[model samples]
Target chain A: PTNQDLQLAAHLRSQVTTLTRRLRREAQADPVQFSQLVVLGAIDRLGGDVTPSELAAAERMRSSNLAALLRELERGGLIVRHARTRVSLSSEGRRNLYGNRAKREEWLVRAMHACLDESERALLAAAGPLLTRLAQFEE
Target chain B: TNQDLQLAAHLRSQVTTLTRRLRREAQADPVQFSQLVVLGAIDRLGGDVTPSELAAAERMRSSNLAALLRELERGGLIVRHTRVSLSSEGRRNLYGNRAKREEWLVRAMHACLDESERALLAAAGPLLTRLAQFE
Candidate 1:
């Protein structure tokens, strides 16, 4: 790889890190843990046909301690299990996903509008999918 | 593009997830993440930095900083004092850790991202930096 590619990785790492710190702080001001939100979002996408093992694979975690968090979410009415392992978000779970994200989006939107010009904003938009893909990248 | 608001949600989630993934990848490095952070912070803040200043910059708790400083102190990385600064060895350690981290990042990006994706990331790099530091 070129040195330019190396520099790009470094730059993105620092910015993404700095921004995540602020966003993570805002997430913690809520009732649920950020980890739980990620799991909730995962279940929302996978729907009821998915099992905990499948989720653990998608998350790339050893297990996400899959049973316990699911148990808690189910306990809280945020999710429901249709079978022994099959799970999906309950109505509350779906709402909780977007509801908790509200604060994070507000701060991010405000920052983007105040800090970026139209071109820069579009730059971030174009780069968003790449960031998501990088996060899910598996060897 | 859609409304900046819609992009905002996607941007926030993506950045958050990527941060966690990057952090986990960092675990493979020899140096502890906190040490690299404190060493760099100390180097930037210049000499005679106190634990309090470090705590503020690193956004770490006082007790946590104390433990970390003690670890560095024992490692001869920093001179623990009323005003702390990196020793010669600490400076070397900082550079070493930085090199290792950058090397890992280059390898990761090369393996995980395509050229087109890298170009997008490179262009937006400065923009992300600006947006990240927004008050």
Candidate 2:
């Protein structure tokens, strides 16, 4: 019993880490970069307009942290900030980020479709509820 | 069916955020702090060890974690305390790493658990077992 229990814990840890590494690899290949991806996604989802302060709060980070992230995008000339306090993706930003996002999504979906057998994929697919459960409230 | 659809979307969202946070955290400390914790645990487990023993004790991949220790040793952060000492750090660094290992664990555990969080972890234990069994 002890042996089996230890084996199981080891397996869970391995799977969790493997999945994490794969996801990191995917994001790393993207042009939006990781942090920029978060800000962009937040902006796209939030719609309308957003300020740096508001963005930081939404992302559970400090304003100073958001300012640092913003500086990177600004230096790259990927974002536009104005007197209206709006942060919008500049044309170049949109081109690079959207392409990167789409590329990563394609690779992931294809892997999901091809790598696992139908039933296993379905089980993973079924994990949708559990995933939603994670989002409903952090435990 | 509708619930399933919603769940699918949730998975995507959760996976995205999880990736984002993991990457950011890694960037915050690129040397991989978890390896240090495991290394300290390995030393504590036996006071000295082989790579295989350390990996088994830490529940990690020997091949990968061995390389990790090798790097740490090369950096002069640890020592091969024993014949097969993976890292180069002596008593001083080992003690320092132990403190770091403790702080890291406490922080991670605290972040993951509130009262309900702790209960949920317990509740999910059996489910985790079942998954492993099925695997």
Candidate 3:
């Protein structure tokens, strides 16, 4: 039973890896760079008033690299840089997260909604908080 | 009544965020995510797995698998001799730094989640494995 737990972890890991890959393939239709989307997602998760250092640590990017990426994001009008180097998403950035009417069907949101059946959807629901706990774990 | 639907949406959003974080963590490592999946298959099959075998297991086209294999070979992470096996460096990459990754995750799990939450994740693992098997 204990061994089964470890096996379960590995299986889940693999599945997450594959699913993430597939979702990303669909995400290519959008103009947003994956990294940019990641930054936006980070801000969304961390809420308003995020800092460069905090985002870099969460995203595992170096300060120098993240600075360049942040500049690009600003130019694209995706994020608003505020006092103390804190950042927040622009309205366009938030819109890009779920996607817009023009490309909603092509977004990852739609893809996930359509991919699972009723049962899988139910299971995903049951497992939702569990997965969130794992993903948002901090040290 | 629609809790499941909302959960689905929330799960998708949360997982998307987590995946980005994992990708960032993986950057220090040379192995790309897809390549790591191939390497995992080889390890699971006890190494020397055929290209076709890996392609089928990974649900990828052979041409795509071939390209990835070439990249892995160029990186000296895998070697082909009848079938693919992890080179010494590959084994080190797979087994060595694996602990580092796990350590990071374990710490995060401890820091952010309560005991029951950890148990919930452990219980959900098998359920996720089942969900992932869809075609």
Q: Rank by DockQ, highest first.
A: 1, 3, 2
**lDDT, candidate 3, B41-118, per-residue tens:** 688778979888776654455655687799999999999995889999888877654544555555566567666665
lDDT, residue B123, candidate 2: 40
Residue-by-residue lDDT tens digits, candidate 1, B1-135: 248678988888778777767755645332365576678779868857998877775445575568778888888889966889899999997766556656666776778777887888888877777776776
- The runs of at least 3 residues in candidate 2 whose Cα sits more than 4 Å from the true structure, single-residue gaps closed, are A1-21, A28-32, B1-11, B18-135
What does candidate 1's lDDT look like per residue over A12-44, in tens digits? 878887777677666643324555786787777
How is the predicted docking of candidate 2 categorized under the CAPRI scheme? Answer: incorrect
- Which has the higher DockQ value, candidate number 2 or candidate number 3? 3
- Highest TM-score model number: 1
TM-score for chain B of all predictions: 0.76, 0.42, 0.68
lDDT of 3 by residue, A32-61 (tens): 376577678778878857999887776555
Give TM per candidate. Answer: 0.65, 0.46, 0.60
Docking class of 3: incorrect
| TM-score-sorted candidate list, best first | 1, 3, 2
| Top DockQ model | 1
Candidate 2 residue lDDT tens string, B67-104: 67777676765566443453445445555543443333
The Cα error of candidate 2 at residue B16, in Å, is 2.8
Show what share of the native A-B interface contacts model 1 retains.
0.64
